[model samples]
Target chain A: EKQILCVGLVVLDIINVVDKYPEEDTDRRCLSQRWQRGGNASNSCTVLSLLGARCAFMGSLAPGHVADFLVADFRQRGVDVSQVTWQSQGDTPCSCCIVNNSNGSRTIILYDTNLPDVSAKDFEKVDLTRFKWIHIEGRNASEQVKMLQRIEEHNAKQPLPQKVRVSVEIEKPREELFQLFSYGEVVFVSKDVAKHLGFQSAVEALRGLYSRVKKGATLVCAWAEEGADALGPDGQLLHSDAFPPPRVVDTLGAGDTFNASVIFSLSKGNSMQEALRFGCQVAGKKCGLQGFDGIV
Target chain B: EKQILCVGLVVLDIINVVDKYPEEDTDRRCLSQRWQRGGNASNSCTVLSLLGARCAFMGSLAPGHVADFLVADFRQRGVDVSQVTWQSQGDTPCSCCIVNNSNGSRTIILYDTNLPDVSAKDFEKVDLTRFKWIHIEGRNASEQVKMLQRIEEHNAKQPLPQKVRVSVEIEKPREELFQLFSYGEVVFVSKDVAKHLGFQSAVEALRGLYSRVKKGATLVCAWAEEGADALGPDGQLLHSDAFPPPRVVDTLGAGDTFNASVIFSLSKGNSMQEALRFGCQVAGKKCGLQGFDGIV
Candidate 1:
C-alpha cells in the first residue's frame, strides 16, 4: 500500500527496570528486563502502523543479533521493512535503557559499530513515488540534504496522485541539520533541540524556526510535560495541553509517538490544532506503557 | 546420552556497557547493549555442553517473551530444556547487568514475579536415571533440601552404573541453605558467600565448611583474581592459580563457568586438583568474553 515512509536508525533496545538508580560504584538488582525494537523513525512507523495507517521504513540494517530482533519486531508490528539496506558484516545499533520505577525517567546507553547510514547513493535506490508521506530524522545532514533534493525532484516529475509530502525531525544537534528545514512540508523539534539553537522556549523557538522554512509549512515544538505548540503558514498559533498519565512506566519513546500521531492525524485531514491535541493524548497514553507496542 | 542435569534458574539478561556507573540522579548514554540467556544453573549447563558433555536443564519457565528467548538460547547452545516447567501465565525471570567499562565489573538487578522455583514436587518429575551427574543452585533452601534427599534416595536404589553424583553451588546466603551441604558429593562457593557466613578468607571458610560435608566430598571457594582454593574430604588443602585475562569484558557468568568446568573435568575422571586448575583456566577465558557464549 502507498503510505508513510520513516527513515533513520532502527535499533534493538534492551530495557531494565529498577526501583531506583544505583550509586557510582555500587550494585543493585534489576526488577525486570525487556527487549524491544527502537529508534526515532522506527518508533514513529510503529505508532503509525498501530493507528491503522499503512506504513513502511527505510534504514540501514546489518545481519546480526540486534538486526535480527529488529526485523522480526517490525514484521510483527505490521510495518514494512523491505526497503531497508542490509549489510552482511558489521553489528547493528542497540540501546540499553534503564527505567527507574520511582519516577519514570530513562537513562540510555547506545552502542553501534560499523552500521552504515543512508547516503545519496543509497537514496537513489528507494522508490519515493510509492509513498504519500515520508518522515526523515536529521542525521548525516549532508547525505540527508541530497536525499531531500531527490524527493523534491521525484514529486515534481510525478502525477498529482503520486506526489509525496515530507516531514523532518531534528531532535539532536548535528552538523548542517538546518539545511533540510526548507524542504519539509512539516517539521518537528523538541525543547532540547530548541535550547541547542539558542531559544529559551518552544514558542520562541518555533517563531524563529518558522522564519527559515518555506511558506505554507507547519512547525511544531514539544515541551516535555508543559505540552506542545504548533505554528501554521498563516501565523496561526495552536496550543495542545499535555495529558499526564496516572502512572508513567517509561518516557523513552514519547516524543516519537507525538510526532507520528501528529503526522497520522494531519494526513487524515484533521485540523492542525486537533492533530496536536490527538498527538498529546497518544503520547500520554504511551508513557504509561513500555516501548511502542502499547500503541498497537 | 546420560549426562549432566542442571537445576535452577534460566533467565533473559539485558546487559549494558557504560563508561562508569552514573550518579543516582543523572543520565548517561550507554556505549552498547546486548541481550543473552543467563542464570546460575543455565550458565553452568552451557559450559558443560561446550566441554563435550551432554547437558540438560530443569527450571521453571513461563510462556512469554522472556521464556521464548531463553528456550531458543538453550536450544542453540545444545543444552536440553525438555524437563523445564512452563507456566501458562506469568513472566520468566530476567536480570539487568550493567558493565562498567572503567573497571570491567558488573552491577546486576533481577526481576522475577510469579516465576516458579523448582520444589520437591517439580524435582520428582525428572528421570534421574538419565543423568550421570546433577548440579543444583542453593535457592529455596527448604525445597532444595527435599530435592537433594530425593536424589540421594534415587542413587541408593539404582544399579551401580545408573547411580548419579550430585553437586551444589552455594553462591548467595539463603535460608536453610546449609541443610543440603552434606548431601552433595562436591560443593562450590564464592568469597562473597564465605564472607556472608562470617569467614574472613577462602581457606578459613573451607576449613569449617569441609567439616560439615560428607566424607570424600570436595569444598571449593573462588577468590576472584586471587584464584581459588579447595578442601578435599580427607582435609587435604589444594590451590588452583587464576588465569587473569589482560582485559575483562564481563564477569557476570564467571563463577558458573568455574563450577561447570570443575564438574566436567572431575566427571571425566580427572583428579580433584586437575579439575580445580582446569576450572580456573576456563573461568579466566570466560572473563575475557561477553556472557557465557565464549566457552561455546
Candidate 2:
C-alpha cells in the first residue's frame, strides 16, 4: 500500500537546448539532447516519490522502447507501476521540448498517436484502500469524475479509515475541466488558466474555484514570478512569495514540482500557509537545476 | 548521365529554436521545431539540382524510416540516388540542430549509427566518365585519393574528352584530410578549419594549401560573416564581400549553398571573381530563408 497514487498521461520527452529561436523554414543546431520520461502524472509521481512518500502510478501503457523507458524510470524512483493498465499494440506518447538558455522557458509539441486514454472501467479496478492521497492530471474530466465517485463508494464501504484526499492539476481551461474540480479536496491552477477563464487575477480565480469544490477543499493558484496564493475552506487567504531561483536553467517542471510538494507537505500535517511556502521553495529550487533532479 | 555527382552523407535533421543555451541541468522550451533534410553533400546537391544542374548522389543508405525520408526528399528535389549503397539493416544518420535567434548561429550534434562510410570499393563501382564534376565531402582521404586516381585512369582511357573536374570540402583538419588536396580542381576550407591547421589568417592558409595541391588547383576559404576568399590557379588572390541578408532565419546550410553555387557558376564558365560573388549572393539569400528552401 502506497501513501499516494498518481493518474493520467505518461509520455517520453526528447529535450534539446538551443541558443535562440529560429526563423521560419530554417535549420538550427542543438547544443545538447536528452531523452527522459515525462507527462503530468508521471512528473507528479516522480516528485512525490522523491519527497520520501510511497507513490504508485495508474495509467495505460503499451509495449515499446518508450514504454520500457517509462516503466524502468518509475521503478528506479520507487514509484510502483504494478497497477498500470497494459496494452499489446500501441505507441507510447512522446513530446519534443526545446529549452532556451537565456531564460528558463520551454516550448513543447506532443504527439499522442496511439496512446490510450484511461476509462471508468480501468479506474474501478484500483484498490482505493491502498493510498491516502491521489493526484490526477485533468484529462477527460468525465472519466475522472467517475473515478472519484468510485473512490467515494469504496470509501463509504470502509468509512473514515479509508477516506482518500484527492488533488487535481487543472492547468488548462478546457470545456469539461471544471467538472472534475468539485471532486478534488485540493485543486491546483496556473495563471494562464485563470486568464483563460476570464479572471483578471489569481485571487479572483481562487474565489471562483472555491464555489465549485466541496467544502473544506483547498484551492491553489500559482502566478509564475509573483508567487502562489491559496484559499482554504474557512475563507482564509494564504499567500506565499516566490523564491528567487539561484540561477534559471530550465522551467519545464516547476509547476508540477509545486503541486507535488504542496500535496506532500499538506499530507504531513503542515498548515495551508506552510505548505504553499514549501511548495514555492521546492519549485524555485527545481528551476535552478535541470530536469527533475532538484526534487530529490 | 548526370553532369555533377555529389558523394558523401545524406541525413535527417531535427531543428529547434531557442533564446539562449540551456544550463546543464535545467529544462527550456523551444520557440519552434522543424525537420529538414540535411548533410554537407545533401545540401550541396539540393542547391545544385535547384540551380538546374543534373546531380546524382552516391553514398550509403539503409532500410529504415530515416533512410526512407532521406531518399524521398532527394527524389523530390530531383537529385538521383540510384547509386546509393543500400543495406538491409542499420540506421540512417541524423543530426539534431539548435538555432540561436540572437546572432543567427547554430550548433549541431550528429548521430551516425550503423551508417556505412563511403569506401574505395564503392568508388571503384562508379563510372567516372559519365560526370563532368564530382564533389566529395572529405571523410576518408585515402579512399578519396584512390577515387581521384580512378577518375584519372578513366580519363586517360578516353584520351581527352572525358576529363572530370573534382571538388572537395575539407571542413575538418583530420590527419589524412590534406592528402586528397592535390586531386581537387577546387578545395574549400572554413575559418575554424584554417585555424586548426595553425594558420593565423585565411590568406596564410591559402598559401599553405597552394604548396600542397597541384599548381593549377584553386584554394578557397570561407570566413563566415567576413565572406570568402580564394587563390585561383593563376595565382590571383580573389575576395568577395558578404551579401547582407534582410533577415537571418537559419545558418545551417549556408556554407553548402556557397560551395554549390560556386561550382555551378564555375561550370557555367564564370571567372573566379564572378563565381565568388555569385556564391556569396546565393549563400546570403539562403541565410534569409529557412532550411534549404532558399535554393528552390
Candidate 3:
C-alpha cells in the first residue's frame, strides 16, 4: 500500500482583522491582511503529501469560475486532485474568519449551500485498487459509508490481504453515525466529541467503544490537556505526547494534520506507538503557525 | 456655532458578483452571508446618535454602505446627527469599496476599509453664533489646499448665520471639488478619487461652478456613477438620479440620513437644491429599510 487516498470538501477562507473580538461597539484593525486556503480534508491531504506520501484527494468541487482559485491552490501542494468531481451547477464554499488577536481564536461565519449527495456511482472512475490506504474526514458520512461499502464489496470478490487500511477523522458529535463503524478499520475522534457525545469522562467514553465498534476496529481520541490516547482491544489504555508547541498562532486544522500523519506512517508500516508520536509532533508543529499549512 | 459637532469620512464603491450561489460544500458555507454596515466614518456617528444626534455625523459613507444602507433608515429619521461642529476635525473624507460574491447572486463577500487622516484637531471649536452650518468630510487634499486649510485661509470669518440650515453629503472629482466654491461646506468622496477626477468625456465634471463665491458653498459629491457631471458655480447641471436600489436588505446607516434630513426642509431659511435633496429625500425613505442612522 504505497498510496493514501483522502476525501472531503474544499473551501475558500477570508480572514479579517478584529482588535478585541465579540467586536465591541468599536473595532480596530488587527493587522494588515493575510489570506489562506484551507479545509479539514484538504489540509490533511496536503500535509500527507508534504510528508512524502503518495496522496490522491477525492471530493466534489463546484466546477466553473469559482473553483479555479481553489484548484490552483490544490495543484500547488502536489496532491492529486483528479478524483474531485466538479459540479457544473453549484457554488463553491467559502468561510469568513474573525480571528481574535489575543488568543488567535476564530469565530467563523459559515453560510453553506445545500450539497448534492455523493454516492459510489460518482466514484466509479477511480481505480480503488490502486491505493492501499484511505482516509475519510467524516464528510457526508452517508456517502463515506456507501463508498467504503463499495470498496469492501469489491475486495470480497478478490483474494487475501484486502490492501485497504481505512480510517475516519471525526470532528462533530455525530453519535448515530458511529454505526458507520462497519466502514472503517480505524477511527479517530476529538475529546470534544467524546464530551459532546455525553460521555461523563474520557475513560467512560472509551468503556464501550470496543463493543460499539466493528469486531476488529481501532479507536483513538485526542485529549488536549491529557494528550492523545487510544483504547486497545485488551481494554488497556495506550497514550502518547509529542513535543509541545513553542507558540500557538491557530488551532483550527491541527487535529487533521495529526490524523493524516499517523495514517501515512501506519501505511508505511511504522509501529503504532511510533506513528502516533510522529503524528502528534506534526500536529504540535501545526499549532506553532498561523494556519494548518503555515508550519508545513 | 461654538458647538462641537459632526465630522467623518466619505467613500466610493465598486462591486462584482457571480450568479446562483451554492448552498454548501462539505466543510465551508457562505449561503447566508450579507454585506451591510460597511462605511467607517458614518458608522462612527451612527452609533453616537443611536444614543442621540446631539453628536452629529459629518463624512461621506461609501454608496453601498452609506446611501444604500443608511439613507432613509430608522436610525437616520430617529437621530439628530448633522447639527454643527466647533471642532477642527476636517470635513468628512472619502473611502472605497469592492464587492465579490459567490455563484449565488444574493450571498456576497465584501472588502472595505477606510484610510482617513482628519480629526478633531484640524479645525477650531468656534462659538455657536460664529458658526451655525458646520460642514465636514473631504479632509484629503494638498496640505495647503486641504478642505480645512482653504476655508480657514480664504473664507471670510463672519459671525456664523443664526438659525441657519446645516447638512452634509459626498461628491468626488477635482472640478467637482473645485466647483464647491463656498467654504464651510461638507462634501464626500470615494477612495477612487483619481479615476473620477478624470471625468473622461463629461464637461459636467465641473459644469456649474466658478472661482467666485456664491451665497455659500453649495455642494457635496456622492458620485453614483464614475465620470458623472459636477455642479458649476452657477449651481446649474445639478443631476441626481434616485439610486433605485434593486433589493437592499442591509444599508447600514445610509450616511447621516438624519444629518441631511435634520434641515432638509426644517430650517425654513436656506434654499439650495443640492442641500434640499440630500437632507430630505435621502432620509425620509432610507428609514423604511434596514440601514445606518447617518441621515441627511
TM-score of chain A of each: 0.96, 0.95, 0.89
DockQ of each: 0.35, 0.08, 0.11
Over B1-296, each residue of candidate 1 has an lDDT whose tens digit, in order, gives: 78799998888777887777755434456777777788889989889988899999988898766677788888998888888887777777767678887798788776735376887898898888889999998887888888989998988888877789999988777637777678788988768778888898888899877877777888989898788899985668898989988898788888899999999999998988999999999999999887776666
Best candidate (score: lDDT): 1
lDDT of 1 at A252: 84
DockQ-based CAPRI category assigned to the predicted complex of candidate 3: incorrect
Worst 10 residues of 1 chain B by lDDT: B22-31
- lDDT (10s digit) by residue, model 2, range B199-293: 87777888876787766889989888788899976888889988969878688889999999999999888998999999999998888877776
In model 2, the runs with Cα more than 4 Å from the true position are: A1-12, A15-136, A139-167, A171-180, A184-296, B19-29, B112-114
Calculate the i-RMS of every candidate, to one decimal place.
Answer: 3.4, 7.8, 9.8
TM-score of chain B of 1: 0.95
The candidate that achieves the highest DockQ relative to the unseen native structure: 1
What is the TM-score ranking, best to worst? 1, 2, 3
Tell me the tens digit of each residue's lDDT in model 1 across A100-213.
888887887667353778778977888776789989988878898888889988888988777798899888865478776787888897687788889998889988788877
Off by over 4 Å in 3: A17-19, A63-65, A157-162, B1-31, B34-140, B143-215, B219-249, B256-296
**True-vs-predicted CA distance for residue B169, candidate 1, Å:** 1.2
